[PDB]
């Protein structure tokens, strides 16, 4: 994966060299974020597209295969800032909020699936937190293979190879690093465009530092990727959800 | 009538002092050219650290309040865009004080013809007539040396016959249309290059200046490109990028478009509001609106992708932006769109088209801000001037965008209302000339400013005539909200469809002065421009009838 090296080098070069005249907005965004122990970063796409058109050309192409190489790309930077040597430092979440063009809820039909979509709606109720996993160790029921699986985002079955089989892998919960998740569910705004019909509600998964960021009932504008999950209820009929990166409430709202 | 460098050394010798200096440069007035000029002028002063007073004058009548009130130690004065038409020697008076007169008022103007009393009989000037109309201009030359100071009965009759002989041809002169020869900025740069400053943002000020007026003609500007492009060739930030780099990082040539706000707005909205295209494609019509979409069907650009902001459109469409237009636009008669333009890139912020910047400043001038009310309003415009002055600065970009979010909105107003007119076919073809009046409309607050009606008037005289046979006929507009029936009425000039044979010399300046000299019914030349005047609804109708006849054209 020299290509991922090529992409991550461009992301480092985007964080370290970026200049708004003359402070480095991101690089200081980083420091001032690790000190308060926020462990997050908010990219402003306009600066991004200003810097290179290219990396935004790919980031609006296949977001879910790229964005995590951006996460690892930035946490590899906080290693050189927040500490120095010659731990532990979670891979930061990035929250990107940008103008673009508002795409109303009714107008989401396929065709933009896995392409970043900014939109606007009133949140109905927030689902109770539950943890997904980030880094979990796994041992085999027989050969006892000790495997540290780095699970990324954005479901993923466990590897069967070190009889043995079919799936002899146990989750060690004593060493496993966990994050959080939310599930907002948002009803589009009553002004537009209900017409004569009840307004649809797309299910959204916030995670890590955006979680509990928003009280249910407050208007917001979400950004996030658009994507689909299975959830047996045929055929095939997969149902739609919006991953959120990252959320920004309306003015102010505090 | 002087060397620019030498007029400069003069304004140098009378300047320095203590408690210096003193000079007040008058920036005037509402014309973006003024800013363009006086900003590079003011930067030039700051270079030698010469103290200055800079005044935002609106009204031509307003200048009298200033010059007559506060002057004490000021031996060297500078003025911009005023006096080319009406002479200030009679208007201010002057009253010669102390040859080698103590105060030198420099008057910079692009307007023609110069006042007769100005250039000859040196008192307050020190004229800026150089070098555009020198000329001769033998018509003003014989106007004085003959006139001044001017068997015996036949010599008296001969003499008087000669006097009227000169007075006739003289009457031909100074009664004429007011038309800008060259942008005052350009000349300030010609003055600036002799001193030796090549500064980049300076040059950008020149580009701004030249491109201030392309909304209205060129006229010479079509040949100003050498005088700019060569200068762009006289410097360069780097031989090759070296992306970006974060500094210098400067202006460059790109295939720019008369298309409106391409870079800071969504593409479809950028055609739909553009001024040149609102004409040829009949966009006020629902039947023509579709023809746009057919354009997009020809380009293969999605409608949804047209609705999206220009920063974020796909890269392929960007690389094909200079091709697809060639492939398609030719077929719609829209082939004149692509200019060779100037674009300054600030890098990581974005880039800005020379023209769009001017759209930002104009946007700033009217928004984003019985005699007491008009004075207070003109005052609000005076304050607003500086809000617009600030946007020129590089170090603050944060408010420049506050201009652009306005520049969009204004069009969304202007276009809208503009269409509100063509639905009712409010155009009166009359006989001698075309004329209109807005009796009612939404949000006349935007239309208070002279320049707003300059742009609406512009999009309308552009819309009515493609051309569009026959006979480009100048247009008239009027609007009223408050200030008790002020009913502002601005003169306009016809637009040729890129094939321009003659300047055509707006005649409303003369036609209005003929009426001020007749019954003068609530006629007010208070606005600095000869084309734009004020009226009352009581006296507007007899004024319109007296406008119809006698027609001077």
UniProtKB/Swiss-Prot annotation, chain A:
Annotated compartments: Nucleus
Functional summary from the UniProt entry: Acts as a component of the MCM2-7 complex (MCM complex) which is the putative replicative helicase essential for 'once per cell cycle' DNA replication initiation and elongation in eukaryotic cells. The active ATPase sites in the MCM2-7 ring are formed through the interaction surfaces of two neighboring subunits such that a critical structure of a conserved arginine finger motif is provided in trans relative to the ATP-binding site of the Walker A box of the adjacent subunit.
Subunit structure: Component of the MCM2-7 complex. The complex forms a toroidal hexameric ring with the proposed subunit order MCM2-MCM6-MCM4-MCM7-MCM3-MCM5; loaded onto DNA, forms a head-head double hexamer. Interacts with CSM1.
Domain of life assignment: Eukaryota
Membership in a protein family: Belongs to the MCM family.
Protein name as annotated: Minichromosome maintenance protein 5
Disulfide bonds: none
Extra information: Present with 10300 molecules/cell in log phase SD medium.
Taxonomic lineage from the root: Eukaryota, Fungi, Dikarya, Ascomycota, Saccharomycotina
Curated annotation (Swiss-Prot), chain B:
Domain of life per record: Eukaryota
GO biological process, one term: double-strand break repair via break-induced replication
One GO CC annotation: nuclear replication fork
An example Gene Ontology molecular-function term: DNA replication origin binding
Chief location of this protein within or outside the cell: nucleus
PANTHER family recorded: CDC45-RELATED PROTEIN, CELL DIVISION CONTROL PROTEIN 45 HOMOLOG
Protein name: Cell division control protein 45
